[PDB]
Every structure is written in structure tokens, then in C-alpha cells.
């Protein structure tokens, strides 16, 4: 059931990275987008955000979201999560780091809830193009028409087709830890943490400790506060500094792997044939740019393939050998002459 995914649900931690277009400039958003994979057909997009969707801190849920503000995971009800493109999208499902959504064509993808007092959105430059499966360069999945073996991402989550790495988080910096006691700098730890003390003054440079204080140095701006939180693990993101140790294992299954489904494809209007002596006058009234392919059935193929968008009449020389033409997604047909 839903709770049979403890590897990603329990162990993972919402990390924060460097969104390129966080609102006005590049801030450090908790929803730093990574690995946009718009490689499907019908226009479904898989986005690997830096936030962890679905699971409340308290084991598991789905109506909740876990994002990291500060040193703590301030989890909330997911409520107004936007997934934007040239036009706003409509999300399908969300599972931990990944969120599957269906978008219209565009050149930018932006993600963001709006926690209410603050927005915390993020975008990234990445073109998204949607080629419908078939011979007709349509734009949106139509109400009716024939069906073809498309490829897309399943809405299902309980799959293990592919895995991704997840190791110990790196040494996250936090300047807010370098407080002072009016005589010397005081370090602090919230709970179970093991911070690192470093300062510019000639002193103990290593400073690995729980709650403690500097030896001699006094200038806050002349020190470093590195934080260690190895209790949880994070995704191997390219915008986060590597931990100096071992690549901790644990294969997080990819929630939405591609599958070979069946999408509804458009159906071009039927051509109006008009026979002529050894000549096939073909009246065409396309609705959207559709491929037209014809080939002679004789010894010489004599291929002809050309996209047609504006309604036009084309003619072909149908010899006694015969001719074949495939208009749109219609099944191929054949013809004679006298």
C-alpha cells in the first residue's frame, strides 16, 4: 500500500540548493528544481524538486508536504502548489522529490507552493515541446480519434524500474550559529547535532564539538559554523557540496518511470477523392498539419512525402502498376487504372 515505500519516505530529507531564478535573482530556495524530464509524448512532465512532497514528518501522508526552512523541516498541508509553463499547468501526482504534471508547450518551467506569508517559488530555463504521437502535428489530445502506442510516465508510484543514489549530506554552513557572549564567540547545537568550529585567529582549527565555545577568537566575521545532520540522507544533487566521507547507499526508487501506454491520437478529415484518367485528384481539408505519404506499387517506389497544412488539391499519376497513399492516421489504401 502507500506505506510500503519507507526507504524514500523515512530516510530522505528535503534539501535546499541554488535555484537560478528564485523570484528576482538566484536565491537558495527549498524547491530548487533539478532534472526536468519532458521526454514523453502527450505532454506529461516529471520534475525532481528539492522539496519532499507527500510525507508529513510523522511517518507518512499524501495531503502534506515537507520542505526545509532553516535547520528544521517545517512540514505543512500542500494547498496551492503551482506548476507553470507558458500557460499554467495541471499537476497529476506528487511523490517525495518528484512531482508529475501535465503542461502546455512553453520554454520555462516554474514550481511553487505559496505557504501564505511567503511564496518560496523557483523556475529554471528549459524548453518543453510536445510532439503528439502519430502523423498529425496536433497540439492537444483530442476528444476522439484513433489510438497509437505512445510512451509516457505512469501515474503509479509503486515501481522499481530504476533507482537513484542517496548518501550522507555534506557540511551545510549556517552563519546564525556564531553567536557571542560579549567576551568570546558561543557555538550552539539544536538537538543531537555535532557542529564544526573554525576561526581565522591562530587557534584550534578543527573544533568538532557539541555545545561549546571558542578558545581565543572573537570576530564572528572571522569564523565558520559548519553543521552536521547525518541522521537523515539527501539526494545526490549537483548543487550541494559533497560530504567528505563515504557514498552511503540506499536506492530510492524513481516514482514515475516511462511506460508504453496508449494515447488518443487525432483523426484527420477524410479526403474527397475525384478520379481522372490515370490520375488521382485528391481534395484535402486538413485541420492541423498532417503528414501525407504516397508510394508507387511498381518496380520503382517513387516516394513522395510532404507535410500539408493549408487545404490544397494534389494529384498523383496512378499507373496500371497501382499506387498507395496514407493520409494522416487513416489506414493505407490502394488504386488501379484502366
Amino acid at each position, epitope marked *: 500500500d502507500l506505506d510500503t515505500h519507507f526507504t524514500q519516505y523515512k530516510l530522505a530529507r528535503p534539501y535546499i540548493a541554488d535555484c537560478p531564478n528564485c523570484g528576482h535573482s538566484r536565491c537558495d530556495s527549498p524547491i530548487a528544481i533539478e532534472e526536468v524530464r519532458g521526454d514523453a509524448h502527450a505532454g506529461v512532465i516529471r520534475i525532481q524538486t528539492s522539496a519532499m512532497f507527500g510525507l508529513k514528518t510523522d511517518g507518512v501522508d499524501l495531503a502534506y508536504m515537507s520542505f526545509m526552512n532553516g535547520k528544521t523541516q517545517k512540514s505543512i498541508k500542500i494547498d496551492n502548489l503551482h506548476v507553470r509553463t507558458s500557460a499554467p499547468c495541471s499537476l497529476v501526482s506528487h511523490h517525495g522529490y518528484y512531482i508529475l504534471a501535465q503542461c502546455p508547450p512553453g520554454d520555462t518551467v516554474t514550481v511553487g507552493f505559496h505557504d501564505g506569508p511567503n511564496r518560496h517559488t523557483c523556475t529554471v530555463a528549459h524548453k518543453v515541446e510536445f510532439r503528439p504521437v502519430g502523423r498529425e502535428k496536433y497540439r492537444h489530445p483530442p476528444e476522439h480519434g484513433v489510438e497509437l502506442p505512445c510512451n509516457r510516465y505512469t501515474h503509479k508510484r509503486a515501481d522499481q524500474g530504476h533507482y537513484v543514489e542517496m548518501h*550522507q549530506p555534506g557540511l551545510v554552513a549556517d552563519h546564525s550559529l556564531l553567536s557571542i557572549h560579549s567576551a568570546k564567540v558561543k557555538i550552539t547545537v539544536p538537538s543531537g547535532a*555535532q557542529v564544526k568550529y573554525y576561526c581565522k585567529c591562530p587557534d*584550534v582549527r*578543527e*573544533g*568538532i*564539538t*557539541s*555545545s*561549546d*565555545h571558542t*578558545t581565543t577568537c572573537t570576530d564572528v566575521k572571522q569564523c565558520r559554523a559548519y553543521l*552536521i545532520d*547525518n541522521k537523515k540522507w539527501v539526494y545526490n544533487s549537483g548543487r550541494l557540496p559533497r*560530504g*567528505e*566521507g*563515504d557514498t552511503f547507499k540506499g536506492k530510492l526508487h524513481v516514482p514515475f518511470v516511462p511506460v508504453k501506454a496508449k494515447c488518443i491520437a487525432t483523426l484527420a478529415p477524410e479526403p474527397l477523392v475525384e478520379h481522372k484518367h490515370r490520375t488521382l485528384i485528391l481534395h484535402l481539408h486538413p485541420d492541423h498539419p498532417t503528414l501525407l505519404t504516397t508510394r508507387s506499387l511498381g518496380s520503382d517506389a517513387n516516394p513522395t512525402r510532404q507535410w500539408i497544412e493549408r487545404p490544397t488539391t494534389v494529384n498523383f499519376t496512378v499507373t496500371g502498376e497501382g499506387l498507395e497513399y496514407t493520409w494522416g492516421n487513416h489506414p493505407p489504401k490502394r488504386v488501379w487504372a484502366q
Partner: antibody
Framework: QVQLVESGGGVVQPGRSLRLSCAAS????????MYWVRQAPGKGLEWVAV????????YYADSVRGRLTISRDNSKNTLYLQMNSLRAEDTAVYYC??????????????????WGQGTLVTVSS | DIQMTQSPSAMSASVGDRVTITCRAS??????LAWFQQKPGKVPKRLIY???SLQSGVPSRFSGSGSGTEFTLTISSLQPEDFATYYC?????????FGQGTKVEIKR
């Protein structure tokens, strides 16, 4: 059974160098933090140095910093202490030790459970 | 650096006595501290860790208390095998200094 066996102790002249070794067995040596502790004749214990499972970090008491170098060879299950510029004050039994046999990258809270019998270093002319 | 101060440096006690050894850190070490017994000519043996976790296989007569800067080893009823030198160790930071050691001798 977990064993640690120190070797390479002996008599050395002041200003000379000596290399201690500690062979390990009965546990996964390459996964655990290793420590040197010394005890001068008739004195209390003195913490000398520590090295991580991978050797990537190394720490030293200020009394030995710049003169002693801790190292390891995980392929040989062997810990080393290179001692340079030895002084009469470095005359001690040197003990090889580890925490309880459970692992970590740059973390430990089981300091000093398993130890060797120690090797005597005498620094004298 | 951190320094560990033990009090007393030596004490005389009888079999059955309650022995209390105090260790003070020069800076806060939370509870990342341990206690070690050494008999003459032997290797040290750990008795307590985390300032109160009794080591597996060590007698229930040993107990530990304190946090932050002030810590203690309490032997509730001193046995003949307990006459030894006792060290505190802080393990919150590296370097990890031992205390000077407290020698428990037989009172006569």
C-alpha cells in the same frame, strides 16, 4: 576475538625517528576509527592522536603536533605512528585502541573499547 | 583546549565503602564522557559511557552522574578488585584528553 598488537617500540636517541605499527584482527579494520594513547612511566593516560576509517582526517595532541604523524593501511589492517624529532618526554608505553566495532565517517561516541597490550618507546642517548 | 580535572588525585577507602570520584571539564562537553579503570601493569578497561550508560558486562555497583561541565563516577560498595586508578575521558571533541586519574587505595 578482537585483537590489537603493537610493534616497533624500543630505545631511540633524542632527535631521531621511530615508526610504531599496530596489526588488527577479529573486526573490519577498514570501517573503524583508530586511536593512539600513551602512558609515561608512573604517569596518567595521555591521548596522542586519532585517524578516520579512510585516513582523510587526522588529529593530534598539541604536545605532539608537527612531530608525530598518524597513518593507516586498510589493505594490511595496520595502523602507524611515525614519530620524528623524539624527545625524552615522549618516553612512554604507546597503546593502539579503537571504539566499539561499529562504523561512521566523521562521528564517534563509543571512544576506546578495544586496545592492544602496548609497546614501550624509550627516548634516551 | 579542553582540560579534564579529577578530584581527588588519590583516596583511601575500605571494602564496602561508597566511593565518589568527580571530574570537571574546562568547557561544556554535554554528556559525551566515559570512565576507565586501570589496574597496575594492565591496559585500561571502560566502565561507563555517555556519562551514565554502564558498559555491558561491568558490575551494577558502578554508576555515573552529571552533565555540561561536572561529572561523577560512584562505586556503591567498593570490592577488593576495584582498587585501581580511575580516569575520566571527554569524547565530545578531538583532541580527547583524559583526566589526571584518581587512585583508589586500600585504607588500613
Amino acid at each position: 576475538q578482537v585483537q590489537l598488537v603493537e610493534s616497533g617500540g624500543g630505545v631511540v636517541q633524542p632527535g631521531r625517528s621511530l615508526r610504531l605499527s599496530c596489526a588488527a584482527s577479529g573486526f573490519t579494520f577498514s570501517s573503524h576509527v583508530m586511536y593512539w594513547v600513551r602512558q609515561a612511566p608512573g604517569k596518567g593516560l595521555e591521548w596522542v592522536a586519532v585517524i578516520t576509517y579512510d585516513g582523510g582526517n587526522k588529529y593530534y595532541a598539541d604536545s605532539v603536533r608537527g612531530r608525530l604523524t598518524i597513518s593507516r593501511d586498510n589493505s594490511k589492517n595496520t595502523l602507524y605512528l611515525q614519530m620524528n624529532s623524539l624527545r625524552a618526554e615522549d618516553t612512554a608505553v604507546y597503546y593502539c585502541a579503537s571504539p566499539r566495532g561499529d562504523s561512521g565517517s566523521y562521528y564517534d561516541i563509543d571512544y576506546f573499547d578495544y586496545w592492544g597490550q602496548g609497546t614501550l618507546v624509550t627516548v634516551s642517548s | 583546549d579542553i582540560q579534564m580535572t579529577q578530584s581527588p588525585s588519590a583516596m583511601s577507602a575500605s571494602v564496602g565503602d561508597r566511593v565518589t570520584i568527580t571530574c570537571r571539564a574546562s568547557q561544556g562537553i554535554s554528556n559525551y564522557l566515559a570512565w576507565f579503570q586501570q589496574k597496575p601493569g594492565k591496559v585500561p578497561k571502560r566502565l561507563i559511557y555517555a556519562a551514565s550508560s554502564l558498559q555491558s558486562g561491568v558490575p551494577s555497583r558502578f554508576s555515573g552522574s552529571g552533565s555540561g561541565t561536572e561529572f561523577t563516577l560512584t562505586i556503591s560498595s567498593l570490592q577488593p578488585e576495584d582498587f585501581a586508578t580511575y580516569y575520566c575521558l571527554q569524547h565530545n571533541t578531538s583532541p580527547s584528553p583524559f583526566g589526571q586519574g584518581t587512585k583508589v587505595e586500600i585504607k588500613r
